[PDB]
Design a protein around this motif. Sequence first.
Motif, PDB file in Angstrom:
ATOM      1  N   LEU A  44       0.798  -1.216   0.000  1.00  0.00           N
ATOM      2  CA  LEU A  44       0.000   0.000   0.000  1.00  0.00           C
ATOM      3  C   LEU A  44       0.833   1.270   0.000  1.00  0.00           C
ATOM      4  N   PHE A  45       2.088   1.195   0.436  1.00  0.00           N
ATOM      5  CA  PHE A  45       2.909   2.377   0.636  1.00  0.00           C
ATOM      6  C   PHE A  45       4.241   2.328  -0.098  1.00  0.00           C
ATOM      7  N   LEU A  46       4.535   1.244  -0.814  1.00  0.00           N
ATOM      8  CA  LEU A  46       5.720   1.144  -1.651  1.00  0.00           C
ATOM      9  C   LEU A  46       5.316   0.594  -3.011  1.00  0.00           C
ATOM     10  N   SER A  47       6.133   0.892  -4.017  1.00  0.00           N
ATOM     11  CA  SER A  47       5.872   0.455  -5.382  1.00  0.00           C
ATOM     12  C   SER A  47       7.196   0.343  -6.128  1.00  0.00           C
ATOM     13  N   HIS A  48       7.106  -0.018  -7.414  1.00  0.00           N
ATOM     14  CA  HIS A  48       8.275   0.004  -8.290  1.00  0.00           C
ATOM     15  C   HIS A  48       9.031   1.318  -8.193  1.00  0.00           C
ATOM     16  N   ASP A  49       8.316   2.425  -7.985  1.00  0.00           N
ATOM     17  CA  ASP A  49       8.962   3.728  -7.877  1.00  0.00           C
ATOM     18  C   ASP A  49      10.015   3.756  -6.779  1.00  0.00           C
ATOM     19  N   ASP A  50       9.946   2.829  -5.826  1.00  0.00           N
ATOM     20  CA  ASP A  50      10.868   2.792  -4.701  1.00  0.00           C
ATOM     21  C   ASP A  50      12.014   1.804  -4.887  1.00  0.00           C
ATOM     22  N   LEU A  51      11.978   0.971  -5.932  1.00  0.00           N
ATOM     23  CA  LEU A  51      13.015  -0.044  -6.107  1.00  0.00           C
ATOM     24  C   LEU A  51      14.375   0.586  -6.376  1.00  0.00           C
ATOM     25  N   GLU A  52      14.405   1.684  -7.135  1.00  0.00           N
ATOM     26  CA  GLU A  52      15.650   2.421  -7.327  1.00  0.00           C
ATOM     27  C   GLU A  52      16.329   2.676  -5.988  1.00  0.00           C
ATOM     28  N   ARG A  53      15.552   3.119  -5.000  1.00  0.00           N
ATOM     29  CA  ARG A  53      16.110   3.463  -3.697  1.00  0.00           C
ATOM     30  C   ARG A  53      16.482   2.214  -2.906  1.00  0.00           C
ATOM     31  N   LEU A  54      15.602   1.210  -2.896  1.00  0.00           N
ATOM     32  CA  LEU A  54      15.830   0.026  -2.074  1.00  0.00           C
ATOM     33  C   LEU A  54      16.992  -0.810  -2.595  1.00  0.00           C
ATOM     34  N   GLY A  55      17.105  -0.949  -3.912  1.00  0.00           N
ATOM     35  CA  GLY A  55      18.056  -1.862  -4.496  1.00  0.00           C
ATOM     36  C   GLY A  55      17.440  -3.233  -4.701  1.00  0.00           C
ATOM     37  N   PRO A  56      18.107  -4.078  -5.493  1.00  0.00           N
ATOM     38  CA  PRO A  56      17.541  -5.403  -5.798  1.00  0.00           C
ATOM     39  C   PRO A  56      17.588  -6.374  -4.634  1.00  0.00           C
ATOM     40  N   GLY A  57      18.465  -6.156  -3.657  1.00  0.00           N
ATOM     41  CA  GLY A  57      18.551  -7.033  -2.508  1.00  0.00           C
ATOM     42  C   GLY A  57      17.508  -6.699  -1.462  1.00  0.00           C
ATOM     43  N   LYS A  58      17.563  -5.473  -0.934  1.00  0.00           N
ATOM     44  CA  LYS A  58      16.572  -5.038   0.045  1.00  0.00           C
ATOM     45  C   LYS A  58      15.165  -5.093  -0.533  1.00  0.00           C
ATOM     46  N   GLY A  59      15.018  -4.779  -1.821  1.00  0.00           N
ATOM     47  CA  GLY A  59      13.717  -4.765  -2.462  1.00  0.00           C
ATOM     48  C   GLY A  59      13.113  -6.128  -2.711  1.00  0.00           C
ATOM     49  N   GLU A  60      13.831  -7.200  -2.390  1.00  0.00           N
ATOM     50  CA  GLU A  60      13.331  -8.549  -2.626  1.00  0.00           C
ATOM     51  C   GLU A  60      12.242  -8.884  -1.616  1.00  0.00           C
ATOM     52  N   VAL A  61      11.048  -9.190  -2.120  1.00  0.00           N
ATOM     53  CA  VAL A  61       9.909  -9.521  -1.274  1.00  0.00           C
ATOM     54  C   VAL A  61       8.952 -10.349  -2.118  1.00  0.00           C
ATOM     55  N   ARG A  62       8.166 -11.195  -1.455  1.00  0.00           N
ATOM     56  CA  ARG A  62       7.173 -12.035  -2.123  1.00  0.00           C
ATOM     57  C   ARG A  62       5.850 -11.876  -1.387  1.00  0.00           C
ATOM     58  N   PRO A  63       4.769 -11.436  -2.055  1.00  0.00           N
ATOM     59  CA  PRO A  63       4.696 -10.956  -3.441  1.00  0.00           C
ATOM     60  C   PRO A  63       5.593  -9.744  -3.670  1.00  0.00           C
ATOM     61  N   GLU A  64       6.176  -9.626  -4.862  1.00  0.00           N
ATOM     62  CA  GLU A  64       7.067  -8.511  -5.148  1.00  0.00           C
ATOM     63  C   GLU A  64       6.295  -7.195  -5.107  1.00  0.00           C
ATOM     64  N   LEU A  65       7.038  -6.099  -4.964  1.00  0.00           N
ATOM     65  CA  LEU A  65       6.413  -4.784  -5.007  1.00  0.00           C
ATOM     66  C   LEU A  65       5.679  -4.598  -6.324  1.00  0.00           C
ATOM     67  N   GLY A  66       4.539  -3.926  -6.256  1.00  0.00           N
ATOM     68  CA  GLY A  66       3.729  -3.703  -7.430  1.00  0.00           C
ATOM     69  C   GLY A  66       3.998  -2.368  -8.093  1.00  0.00           C
ATOM     70  N   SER A  67       3.401  -2.205  -9.267  1.00  0.00           N
ATOM     71  CA  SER A  67       3.416  -0.927  -9.952  1.00  0.00           C
ATOM     72  C   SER A  67       2.580   0.092  -9.183  1.00  0.00           C
ATOM     73  N   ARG A  68       2.704   1.362  -9.579  1.00  0.00           N
ATOM     74  CA  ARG A  68       1.827   2.382  -9.015  1.00  0.00           C
ATOM     75  C   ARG A  68       0.369   2.043  -9.282  1.00  0.00           C
ATOM     76  N   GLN A  69       0.087   1.404 -10.418  1.00  0.00           N
ATOM     77  CA  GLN A  69      -1.286   1.033 -10.738  1.00  0.00           C
ATOM     78  C   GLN A  69      -1.782  -0.088  -9.829  1.00  0.00           C
ATOM     79  N   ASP A  70      -0.900  -1.017  -9.453  1.00  0.00           N
ATOM     80  CA  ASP A  70      -1.263  -2.021  -8.455  1.00  0.00           C
ATOM     81  C   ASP A  70      -1.619  -1.357  -7.131  1.00  0.00           C
ATOM     82  N   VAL A  71      -0.756  -0.457  -6.657  1.00  0.00           N
ATOM     83  CA  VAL A  71      -1.002   0.218  -5.387  1.00  0.00           C
ATOM     84  C   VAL A  71      -2.310   0.989  -5.444  1.00  0.00           C
ATOM     85  N   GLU A  72      -2.559   1.693  -6.548  1.00  0.00           N
ATOM     86  CA  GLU A  72      -3.779   2.485  -6.630  1.00  0.00           C
ATOM     87  C   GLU A  72      -5.018   1.597  -6.696  1.00  0.00           C
ATOM     88  N   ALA A  73      -4.899   0.394  -7.266  1.00  0.00           N
ATOM     89  CA  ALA A  73      -6.037  -0.519  -7.304  1.00  0.00           C
ATOM     90  C   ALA A  73      -6.367  -1.051  -5.917  1.00  0.00           C
TER      91      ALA A  73
END
Lengths: 362, 362
Positions: free
Chosen positions: B184-213
């Motif tokens: 609800l509060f993170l998206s692909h827009d945040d992966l740049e900041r997190l990096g591919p290691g920290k950003g690893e999560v299942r289910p993976e982070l969604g697009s802004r459109q996922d979050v808005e849905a």
Amino acid sequence: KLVRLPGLIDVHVHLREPGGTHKEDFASGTAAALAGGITMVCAMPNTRPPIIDGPALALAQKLAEAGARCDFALFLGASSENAGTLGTVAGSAAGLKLYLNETLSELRLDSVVQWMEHFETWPSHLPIVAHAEQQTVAAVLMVAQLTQRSVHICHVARKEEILLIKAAKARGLPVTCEVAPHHLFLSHDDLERLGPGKGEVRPELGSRQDVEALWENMAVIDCFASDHAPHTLEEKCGSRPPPGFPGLETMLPLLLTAVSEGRLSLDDLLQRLHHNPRRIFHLPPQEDTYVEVDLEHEWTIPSHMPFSKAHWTPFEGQKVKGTVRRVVLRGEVAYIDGQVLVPPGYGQDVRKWPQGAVPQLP
Amino acid sequence: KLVRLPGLIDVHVHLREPGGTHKEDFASGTAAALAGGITMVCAMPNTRPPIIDGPALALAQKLAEAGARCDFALFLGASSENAGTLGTVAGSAAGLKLYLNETLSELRLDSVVQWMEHFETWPSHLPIVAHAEQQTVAAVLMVAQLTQRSVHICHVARKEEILLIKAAKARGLPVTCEVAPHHLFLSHDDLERLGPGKGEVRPELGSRQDVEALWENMAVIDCFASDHAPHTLEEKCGSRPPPGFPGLETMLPLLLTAVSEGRLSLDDLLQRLHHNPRRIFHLPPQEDTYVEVDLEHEWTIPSHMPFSKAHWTPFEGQKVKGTVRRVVLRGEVAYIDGQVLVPPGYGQDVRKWPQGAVPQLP
Ligand SMILES: [Zn+2]
Ligand SMILES: [Zn+2]
Ligand SMILES: [Zn+2]
Ligand SMILES: [Zn+2]
Ligand SMILES: [Zn+2]
Ligand SMILES: [Zn+2]
């Protein structure tokens, strides 16, 4: 052999005190509730005087604290005069009740603008309940959307109504609803037997197709509630019969019969008589409170149940399987096998418990 | 200035004990829970050894009773070997957890027939939860219908998933679901900041459109749950980063910020962190238990929250408004302003409380 259930909640009862105590009072109505496995009731405001202002609420609260055998909350009633005047006592009530169809002089609202005024002035975090039949359901849903808040629809009785609510929920609208047992277990097919006087109820009994739509759309029903509306047999049979059935002592036996037949699950029942009432009306848990039922005992509903002063029942003759054996309320045996064992006044106003206040932003 | 909330419930936490105690243990994880306003947690079974049989459950129950600072229930995990073997202990668990996508060797199910076997053998009145991503949601819903029972879908993260669940609910199917704060509060827009290691999560982070849905379809979301999945920074940054975020200490601050912004109501929050968790998992009330929050205090999430051994957070840098000031658990001050004040072992297994057993037909 027995099953332990949590303390069940009936969010729609008419206990007739003050002013109609020959029909029922707090002591007799809550005895009926306990015998039906109900440990908490929400009492409606169409009493005499009606609970439409702070002095009447103050009176009703003391009468209930002195007479109730189980725990309770009291509804306030919307009138054509009190919008914007209930803010100080609103949080002490179960919620606000709107009577949107034919009703008692003092609760009659003349105009949808009066509905809007109540939705606009009643605190946004507190429950609003509406008696709304047929197209009135659509109308009050519109008012709820215009004021961007939730509404709870009382005693849904018709295919028309449950499908409208279903469509509203599919659009994500904040609406919940309740269904009473007479709209699940009685129909036009029973009017021949009941007669035009006893059969008088609002919402009126539905067709078999109405009843079958409610069962088919059980997923849409959030709560069961009795709409316990005691009137004496003399009143139901006389010239101007008032609408309503008594139902506290028969609701759970009827529903347990349905569970035993596989028409719904035990969980379906407990969502609708415990969990959803809690979360819609923000009712508190009851410590050391439970109900023991026997699911094997088969019996026939008699001409009147033991406790309600109504002294009649529309379910007379129906075969049921399931009976309340024991009720424990806050650590005391409240009911065993046809005998109520807590005195009038044991019950408490749950809105005065710290855990019974509705959470609100500062 | 403060607001009193009921004891909040997180139905999806990984507390890593036994076997992963460098990531978190019961004592540290429940300290994190208390600091996040959470007073009851449901712990997932993918520990080492995994909680896939009675001996492992027995061990985990004693470790939790000795280490937990808040109350808890423990999930059993479905394996390719244990269908039909859990009937004796099933009622002592929070529920059964099915891991239907890529997972740990022992919880891996090779075939939808194995899902069916679990739905057929697990007691019909007890909860089943599934980690099911994308089309797996549709697949497990099919299995639930074939076996005519309910299922709860963990961490819904995608527009695809919430719209499928929405369509299922519109057909009256018994499905509920939960959403985690990072979806609800993170998206692909945040992966740049997190990096591919920290950003690893299942289910993976969604697009802004996922979050808005997810926000647009809040009505479809039954629960919020953290999916608290502590891994150390060394593990998240190394070669084979495991999926998961810590989240217990940040969930409520993030959601309270959303409430203060008008994105959802206080009631919406309490339905999803208290009432619905209760009724889906049949979790008991907690006596004399409440959480006091301050809705006015603005702060920035730091690089790590005080209590989780994860010692990192993906929400670093986000501005929040809302902070847990005090937690009272069963009559004892459990948390005040950055200090946990109940020892390891204060917490109890709620399934051993009389009110914590799931009602069942004889
Ligand atoms: Zn009602
Ligand atoms: Zn009524
Ligand atoms: Zn509440
Ligand atoms: Zn989950
Ligand atoms: Zn998980
Ligand atoms: Zn329950």
